[PDB]
Design a protein around this ligand. Structure first.
Ligand SMILES: Cn1c(=O)c2c(ncn2C)n(C)c1=O
Ligand SMILES: Cn1c(=O)c2c(ncn2C)n(C)c1=O
Length: 388
Protein backbone atom coordinates (compact mmCIF):
# COMPACT_ATOMS: atom_id res chain seq x y z
CA UNK A 1 0.00 0.00 0.00
CA UNK A 2 1.16 3.61 -0.65
CA UNK A 3 4.12 5.37 -2.27
CA UNK A 4 7.87 5.50 -1.66
CA UNK A 5 9.36 8.68 -0.13
CA UNK A 6 13.13 8.09 -0.06
CA UNK A 7 15.52 10.61 1.46
CA UNK A 8 19.32 10.87 1.42
CA UNK A 9 20.79 11.50 4.86
CA UNK A 10 24.50 12.24 4.74
CA UNK A 11 26.71 11.25 7.67
CA UNK A 12 28.72 14.50 7.30
CA UNK A 13 25.50 16.47 7.79
CA UNK A 14 26.06 16.09 11.54
CA UNK A 15 28.99 18.60 11.56
CA UNK A 16 28.77 21.88 10.01
CA UNK A 17 25.13 21.55 8.79
CA UNK A 18 24.20 20.41 12.33
CA UNK A 19 21.63 17.95 11.04
CA UNK A 20 21.09 14.87 13.19
CA UNK A 21 18.97 11.78 12.48
CA UNK A 22 16.40 12.88 15.11
CA UNK A 23 15.61 15.92 12.92
CA UNK A 24 14.25 13.79 10.05
CA UNK A 25 10.50 13.76 9.38
CA UNK A 26 10.64 10.08 10.26
CA UNK A 27 6.88 9.58 9.92
CA UNK A 28 6.98 10.91 6.32
CA UNK A 29 9.91 8.87 4.95
CA UNK A 30 9.86 5.21 3.95
CA UNK A 31 13.52 4.90 3.02
CA UNK A 32 16.51 6.68 4.49
CA UNK A 33 19.45 6.38 2.11
CA UNK A 34 22.20 6.53 4.72
CA UNK A 35 25.26 7.86 2.88
CA UNK A 36 28.05 6.97 2.18
CA UNK A 37 30.12 3.85 2.75
CA UNK A 38 33.45 3.69 0.92
CA UNK A 39 34.94 0.69 -0.90
CA UNK A 40 38.27 -0.80 -1.96
CA UNK A 41 39.24 -2.18 -5.38
CA UNK A 42 39.07 -5.69 -3.90
CA UNK A 43 35.38 -5.17 -3.07
CA UNK A 44 35.75 -4.45 0.66
CA UNK A 45 33.07 -2.01 1.86
CA UNK A 46 34.00 0.12 4.91
CA UNK A 47 32.91 3.11 7.02
CA UNK A 48 34.36 6.44 5.86
CA UNK A 49 33.55 8.03 9.23
CA UNK A 50 33.25 5.70 12.25
CA UNK A 51 32.62 8.68 14.55
CA UNK A 52 29.50 9.77 12.67
CA UNK A 53 28.38 6.21 11.92
CA UNK A 54 29.03 4.50 15.27
CA UNK A 55 30.83 6.44 18.01
CA UNK A 56 29.25 9.87 18.50
CA UNK A 57 27.43 9.96 21.83
CA UNK A 58 24.21 11.93 21.88
CA UNK A 59 22.81 13.32 25.16
CA UNK A 60 20.82 10.06 25.67
CA UNK A 61 23.87 7.76 25.26
CA UNK A 62 25.79 6.14 28.13
CA UNK A 63 29.57 5.67 28.41
CA UNK A 64 29.26 2.58 30.58
CA UNK A 65 26.97 0.20 28.69
CA UNK A 66 27.72 -3.51 29.04
CA UNK A 67 29.38 -5.15 25.98
CA UNK A 68 30.11 -3.77 22.50
CA UNK A 69 27.47 -1.25 21.45
CA UNK A 70 26.51 1.01 18.53
CA UNK A 71 26.08 4.76 18.97
CA UNK A 72 26.36 7.56 16.42
CA UNK A 73 23.85 7.82 13.59
CA UNK A 74 23.34 4.04 13.58
CA UNK A 75 21.76 3.98 17.04
CA UNK A 76 19.84 7.20 16.26
CA UNK A 77 18.33 5.74 13.11
CA UNK A 78 17.45 2.46 14.83
CA UNK A 79 15.56 4.49 17.47
CA UNK A 80 13.55 6.02 14.61
CA UNK A 81 12.89 2.55 13.12
CA UNK A 82 11.30 1.38 16.37
CA UNK A 83 8.98 4.44 16.44
CA UNK A 84 8.17 4.45 12.72
CA UNK A 85 7.57 1.00 11.30
CA UNK A 86 7.40 2.05 7.65
CA UNK A 87 10.88 3.59 7.99
CA UNK A 88 13.46 1.42 6.20
CA UNK A 89 17.14 2.33 6.51
CA UNK A 90 19.28 1.65 3.43
CA UNK A 91 23.05 1.38 3.46
CA UNK A 92 24.19 3.62 0.59
CA UNK A 93 27.55 2.67 -0.86
CA UNK A 94 29.82 4.71 -3.13
CA UNK A 95 28.40 7.92 -4.53
CA UNK A 96 29.72 10.68 -6.76
CA UNK A 97 33.10 10.97 -4.97
CA UNK A 98 33.68 7.29 -4.04
CA UNK A 99 32.87 5.46 -7.28
CA UNK A 100 36.49 5.10 -8.51
CA UNK A 101 36.91 1.53 -7.19
CA UNK A 102 33.55 0.18 -8.46
CA UNK A 103 34.89 -1.17 -11.80
CA UNK A 104 37.50 -3.25 -9.94
CA UNK A 105 35.15 -4.17 -7.04
CA UNK A 106 32.66 -5.59 -9.57
CA UNK A 107 35.35 -7.20 -11.75
CA UNK A 108 35.69 -10.78 -10.44
CA UNK A 109 33.71 -13.46 -8.65
CA UNK A 110 36.01 -12.90 -5.63
CA UNK A 111 35.68 -9.12 -5.50
CA UNK A 112 31.90 -9.30 -5.99
CA UNK A 113 31.67 -11.88 -3.18
CA UNK A 114 33.73 -9.63 -0.89
CA UNK A 115 31.46 -6.66 -1.68
CA UNK A 116 28.32 -8.82 -1.01
CA UNK A 117 29.62 -10.22 2.14
CA UNK A 118 31.06 -6.98 3.70
CA UNK A 119 28.00 -4.91 2.68
CA UNK A 120 25.55 -7.35 4.26
CA UNK A 121 27.80 -7.56 7.34
CA UNK A 122 27.29 -3.81 7.93
CA UNK A 123 23.57 -4.09 7.24
CA UNK A 124 23.10 -6.93 9.75
CA UNK A 125 25.36 -5.36 12.43
CA UNK A 126 23.90 -1.87 12.11
CA UNK A 127 20.24 -3.01 11.99
CA UNK A 128 19.50 -1.67 8.49
CA UNK A 129 16.84 -2.86 6.00
CA UNK A 130 18.79 -3.06 2.73
CA UNK A 131 21.60 -1.87 0.49
CA UNK A 132 21.69 0.94 -2.04
CA UNK A 133 24.52 0.79 -4.59
CA UNK A 134 25.52 4.15 -6.03
CA UNK A 135 28.02 3.50 -8.84
CA UNK A 136 28.55 6.69 -10.80
CA UNK A 137 29.02 5.38 -13.42
CA UNK A 138 29.66 2.11 -15.31
CA UNK A 139 31.70 3.03 -18.40
CA UNK A 140 31.95 -0.14 -20.49
CA UNK A 141 29.76 -3.07 -21.51
CA UNK A 142 32.02 -5.12 -19.19
CA UNK A 143 31.19 -2.74 -16.30
CA UNK A 144 27.45 -2.92 -17.14
CA UNK A 145 27.48 -6.75 -17.06
CA UNK A 146 29.63 -6.76 -13.91
CA UNK A 147 27.15 -4.41 -12.24
CA UNK A 148 24.35 -6.93 -12.78
CA UNK A 149 26.58 -9.74 -11.48
CA UNK A 150 27.49 -7.64 -8.41
CA UNK A 151 23.85 -6.90 -7.62
CA UNK A 152 22.88 -10.59 -8.09
CA UNK A 153 25.66 -11.60 -5.67
CA UNK A 154 24.41 -9.05 -3.14
CA UNK A 155 20.85 -10.34 -3.63
CA UNK A 156 22.15 -13.89 -2.96
CA UNK A 157 23.85 -12.72 0.25
CA UNK A 158 20.73 -10.87 1.48
CA UNK A 159 18.55 -13.94 0.80
CA UNK A 160 20.90 -16.37 2.59
CA UNK A 161 21.42 -13.97 5.49
CA UNK A 162 17.64 -13.65 5.84
CA UNK A 163 16.96 -17.41 5.72
CA UNK A 164 19.46 -17.88 8.57
CA UNK A 165 18.80 -14.81 10.79
CA UNK A 166 15.65 -12.91 9.78
CA UNK A 167 12.89 -15.48 9.17
CA UNK A 168 12.73 -14.64 5.47
CA UNK A 169 12.40 -10.86 5.90
CA UNK A 170 12.90 -9.35 2.43
CA UNK A 171 15.87 -7.01 2.77
CA UNK A 172 15.94 -4.51 -0.06
CA UNK A 173 18.36 -3.70 -2.87
CA UNK A 174 18.37 -0.46 -4.83
CA UNK A 175 20.58 1.79 -6.96
CA UNK A 176 20.97 5.46 -7.69
CA UNK A 177 20.48 5.65 -11.48
CA UNK A 178 21.61 8.13 -14.19
CA UNK A 179 19.22 10.41 -16.07
CA UNK A 180 21.95 11.19 -18.65
CA UNK A 181 21.66 9.06 -21.84
CA UNK A 182 25.45 8.72 -22.17
CA UNK A 183 25.28 6.84 -18.86
CA UNK A 184 21.91 5.06 -18.95
CA UNK A 185 22.54 3.74 -22.47
CA UNK A 186 25.48 1.76 -21.00
CA UNK A 187 23.34 0.06 -18.35
CA UNK A 188 21.61 -3.32 -18.62
CA UNK A 189 18.30 -1.66 -17.74
CA UNK A 190 15.96 -4.65 -18.11
CA UNK A 191 18.26 -6.84 -16.01
CA UNK A 192 18.57 -4.13 -13.34
CA UNK A 193 14.75 -3.80 -13.24
CA UNK A 194 14.46 -7.55 -12.66
CA UNK A 195 16.99 -7.90 -9.84
CA UNK A 196 16.39 -4.67 -7.86
CA UNK A 197 13.57 -3.55 -5.58
CA UNK A 198 13.95 0.06 -6.62
CA UNK A 199 15.75 2.28 -9.10
CA UNK A 200 16.20 5.81 -7.72
CA UNK A 201 16.44 8.09 -10.73
CA UNK A 202 18.82 11.01 -10.20
CA UNK A 203 16.60 13.47 -12.07
CA UNK A 204 18.69 16.50 -11.17
CA UNK A 205 22.08 18.14 -11.75
CA UNK A 206 21.19 18.59 -15.46
CA UNK A 207 22.96 21.96 -15.53
CA UNK A 208 25.86 23.63 -13.77
CA UNK A 209 29.40 25.01 -14.21
CA UNK A 210 30.21 22.47 -16.95
CA UNK A 211 27.67 24.16 -19.30
CA UNK A 212 28.40 27.13 -21.57
CA UNK A 213 24.96 28.55 -20.76
CA UNK A 214 22.58 28.59 -17.78
CA UNK A 215 19.95 25.86 -17.65
CA UNK A 216 17.28 23.98 -15.72
CA UNK A 217 18.87 21.38 -13.48
CA UNK A 218 15.77 19.24 -12.91
CA UNK A 219 13.18 19.96 -15.64
CA UNK A 220 10.50 17.40 -16.53
CA UNK A 221 10.34 18.08 -20.27
CA UNK A 222 12.49 19.39 -23.13
CA UNK A 223 11.94 23.10 -23.76
CA UNK A 224 10.93 23.55 -27.41
CA UNK A 225 10.99 27.36 -27.17
CA UNK A 226 14.40 27.55 -25.51
CA UNK A 227 16.15 24.14 -25.88
CA UNK A 228 19.57 25.42 -24.75
CA UNK A 229 18.01 25.71 -21.28
CA UNK A 230 17.23 21.95 -21.26
CA UNK A 231 20.30 19.83 -22.14
CA UNK A 232 18.48 16.93 -20.37
CA UNK A 233 14.92 16.03 -19.37
CA UNK A 234 13.33 13.69 -16.86
CA UNK A 235 10.84 12.57 -19.52
CA UNK A 236 13.56 11.32 -21.91
CA UNK A 237 15.08 9.29 -19.07
CA UNK A 238 11.86 7.83 -17.64
CA UNK A 239 10.67 6.95 -21.18
CA UNK A 240 13.99 5.22 -21.95
CA UNK A 241 13.86 3.18 -18.73
CA UNK A 242 10.21 2.13 -19.19
CA UNK A 243 10.74 1.32 -22.91
CA UNK A 244 13.70 -0.87 -21.87
CA UNK A 245 11.41 -3.04 -19.71
CA UNK A 246 12.00 -1.49 -16.31
CA UNK A 247 8.71 -1.75 -14.35
CA UNK A 248 7.43 1.80 -13.81
CA UNK A 249 6.55 0.89 -10.20
CA UNK A 250 10.24 0.32 -9.39
CA UNK A 251 11.27 3.74 -10.70
CA UNK A 252 11.53 6.38 -7.97
CA UNK A 253 11.64 10.05 -9.04
CA UNK A 254 14.67 11.91 -7.65
CA UNK A 255 14.28 15.60 -6.81
CA UNK A 256 16.75 18.21 -5.49
CA UNK A 257 16.51 19.95 -2.12
CA UNK A 258 18.95 22.59 -3.40
CA UNK A 259 19.40 25.17 -6.15
CA UNK A 260 22.11 25.45 -8.81
CA UNK A 261 23.03 29.09 -9.42
CA UNK A 262 24.08 30.99 -12.54
CA UNK A 263 25.31 34.53 -11.67
CA UNK A 264 25.44 37.34 -14.23
CA UNK A 265 23.00 35.86 -16.72
CA UNK A 266 20.06 37.21 -18.77
CA UNK A 267 18.01 34.10 -17.94
CA UNK A 268 17.69 30.39 -18.79
CA UNK A 269 19.87 29.32 -21.77
CA UNK A 270 22.17 32.42 -21.54
CA UNK A 271 25.82 33.18 -20.95
CA UNK A 272 26.67 33.47 -17.26
CA UNK A 273 29.68 35.00 -15.42
CA UNK A 274 30.11 32.55 -12.55
CA UNK A 275 28.17 30.00 -10.48
CA UNK A 276 28.95 32.31 -7.53
CA UNK A 277 28.92 31.46 -3.82
CA UNK A 278 26.88 28.76 -2.10
CA UNK A 279 25.63 27.32 1.18
CA UNK A 280 28.44 24.75 1.53
CA UNK A 281 30.09 24.79 -1.89
CA UNK A 282 30.20 27.27 -4.77
CA UNK A 283 27.10 27.64 -6.92
CA UNK A 284 24.79 25.43 -4.83
CA UNK A 285 22.20 26.72 -2.32
CA UNK A 286 20.22 24.81 0.31
CA UNK A 287 16.51 24.87 -0.53
CA UNK A 288 15.80 26.28 2.95
CA UNK A 289 17.46 29.59 2.00
CA UNK A 290 15.61 29.89 -1.35
CA UNK A 291 14.19 32.09 -2.72
CA UNK A 292 16.42 35.02 -1.73
CA UNK A 293 15.26 38.60 -1.23
CA UNK A 294 15.12 40.38 -4.59
CA UNK A 295 14.45 37.20 -6.58
CA UNK A 296 11.08 36.23 -8.14
CA UNK A 297 10.02 32.60 -8.52
CA UNK A 298 9.29 31.70 -12.15
CA UNK A 299 7.45 28.60 -13.41
CA UNK A 300 8.09 27.26 -16.91
CA UNK A 301 5.12 24.93 -17.32
CA UNK A 302 6.20 23.71 -20.77
CA UNK A 303 9.69 22.68 -19.58
CA UNK A 304 8.23 21.63 -16.20
CA UNK A 305 10.76 23.60 -14.17
CA UNK A 306 10.87 26.34 -11.50
CA UNK A 307 13.69 28.79 -10.82
CA UNK A 308 14.23 32.11 -9.05
CA UNK A 309 15.50 35.07 -11.03
CA UNK A 310 16.83 38.34 -9.61
CA UNK A 311 16.98 40.88 -12.45
CA UNK A 312 19.14 43.35 -10.47
CA UNK A 313 21.92 40.83 -9.71
CA UNK A 314 21.11 38.92 -12.93
CA UNK A 315 21.12 35.66 -10.97
CA UNK A 316 19.18 32.51 -11.83
CA UNK A 317 18.84 29.69 -9.31
CA UNK A 318 17.41 26.38 -10.60
CA UNK A 319 15.57 24.53 -7.82
CA UNK A 320 12.24 22.86 -7.00
CA UNK A 321 9.46 24.73 -5.19
CA UNK A 322 6.71 22.91 -3.26
CA UNK A 323 4.42 23.46 -6.26
CA UNK A 324 6.98 22.08 -8.60
CA UNK A 325 7.19 18.98 -6.34
CA UNK A 326 3.38 18.69 -6.63
CA UNK A 327 3.65 18.95 -10.42
CA UNK A 328 6.37 16.31 -10.50
CA UNK A 329 4.35 13.88 -8.34
CA UNK A 330 1.36 14.39 -10.63
CA UNK A 331 3.60 13.53 -13.61
CA UNK A 332 4.94 10.46 -11.74
CA UNK A 333 1.42 9.28 -10.85
CA UNK A 334 0.43 9.44 -14.55
CA UNK A 335 3.29 7.09 -15.37
CA UNK A 336 2.76 4.83 -12.32
CA UNK A 337 6.22 5.46 -10.86
CA UNK A 338 6.76 4.05 -7.37
CA UNK A 339 7.33 7.30 -5.51
CA UNK A 340 9.76 10.14 -4.81
CA UNK A 341 13.39 10.48 -3.74
CA UNK A 342 15.31 13.48 -2.43
CA UNK A 343 18.90 14.68 -2.08
CA UNK A 344 19.29 15.66 0.69
CA UNK A 345 17.56 15.89 4.10
CA UNK A 346 19.40 18.66 5.87
CA UNK A 347 18.50 21.42 3.39
CA UNK A 348 14.72 21.03 3.62
CA UNK A 349 12.28 23.63 4.95
CA UNK A 350 9.97 22.80 7.88
CA UNK A 351 6.15 22.62 7.98
CA UNK A 352 4.13 22.57 4.79
CA UNK A 353 6.94 24.11 2.69
CA UNK A 354 8.98 20.95 3.30
CA UNK A 355 9.61 19.31 -0.09
CA UNK A 356 9.68 15.90 1.63
CA UNK A 357 6.28 16.64 3.28
CA UNK A 358 4.84 18.19 0.09
CA UNK A 359 5.78 15.03 -1.87
CA UNK A 360 4.04 12.72 0.61
CA UNK A 361 0.91 14.95 0.72
CA UNK A 362 0.79 14.84 -3.09
CA UNK A 363 1.48 11.09 -3.21
CA UNK A 364 -1.11 10.12 -0.66
CA UNK A 365 -0.29 7.39 1.72
CA UNK A 366 3.17 6.15 2.75
CA UNK A 367 4.63 2.79 1.62
CA UNK A 368 3.25 0.30 4.14
CA UNK A 369 6.20 -2.12 3.85
CA UNK A 370 7.38 -2.79 7.42
CA UNK A 371 11.01 -2.48 8.49
CA UNK A 372 12.95 -5.22 10.36
CA UNK A 373 13.59 -5.00 14.13
CA UNK A 374 15.31 -8.39 14.53
CA UNK A 375 19.14 -8.57 14.25
CA UNK A 376 20.22 -11.67 16.22
CA UNK A 377 23.66 -11.79 14.54
CA UNK A 378 24.60 -8.17 15.26
CA UNK A 379 28.04 -7.71 16.80
CA UNK A 380 26.48 -4.78 18.74
CA UNK A 381 24.65 -5.90 21.88
CA UNK A 382 22.25 -2.95 21.93
CA UNK A 383 21.29 -3.54 18.28
CA UNK A 384 20.81 -7.28 18.87
CA UNK A 385 18.48 -6.36 21.75
CA UNK A 386 16.62 -3.80 19.60
CA UNK A 387 17.57 -1.05 22.12
CA UNK A 388 15.15 -2.67 24.61
C1 LIG B 1 27.44 13.94 -4.05
N1 LIG B 1 26.12 13.46 -4.52
C2 LIG B 1 25.91 12.12 -4.60
O1 LIG B 1 26.79 11.28 -4.32
C3 LIG B 1 24.56 11.70 -5.07
C4 LIG B 1 23.58 12.74 -5.39
N2 LIG B 1 22.45 12.11 -5.78
C5 LIG B 1 22.71 10.78 -5.70
N3 LIG B 1 23.97 10.52 -5.28
C6 LIG B 1 24.54 9.18 -5.10
N4 LIG B 1 23.89 14.03 -5.28
C7 LIG B 1 22.91 15.07 -5.61
C8 LIG B 1 25.14 14.36 -4.84
O2 LIG B 1 25.40 15.60 -4.74
C1 LIG C 1 26.57 16.17 -12.97
N1 LIG C 1 26.40 15.65 -11.60
C2 LIG C 1 27.18 16.16 -10.62
O1 LIG C 1 28.05 17.04 -10.84
C3 LIG C 1 26.96 15.61 -9.27
C4 LIG C 1 25.94 14.58 -9.09
N2 LIG C 1 25.94 14.25 -7.79
C5 LIG C 1 26.90 15.02 -7.21
N3 LIG C 1 27.52 15.84 -8.08
C6 LIG C 1 28.61 16.80 -7.75
N4 LIG C 1 25.21 14.15 -10.13
C7 LIG C 1 24.19 13.12 -9.93
C8 LIG C 1 25.45 14.69 -11.36
O2 LIG C 1 24.76 14.27 -12.33
Amino acid sequence: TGSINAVYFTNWGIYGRNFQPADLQASKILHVLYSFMNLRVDGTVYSGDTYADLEKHYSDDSWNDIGTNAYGCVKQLYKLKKANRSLKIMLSIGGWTWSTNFPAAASTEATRATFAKTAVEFMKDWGFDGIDVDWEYPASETDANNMVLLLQRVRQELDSYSATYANGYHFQLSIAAPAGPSHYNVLKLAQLGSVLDNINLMAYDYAGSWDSVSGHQTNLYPSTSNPSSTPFSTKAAVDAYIAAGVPASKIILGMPIYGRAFVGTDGPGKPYSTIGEGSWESGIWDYKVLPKAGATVITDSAAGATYSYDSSSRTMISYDTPDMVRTKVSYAKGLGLGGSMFWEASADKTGSDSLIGTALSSMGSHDSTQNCLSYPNSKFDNIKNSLS
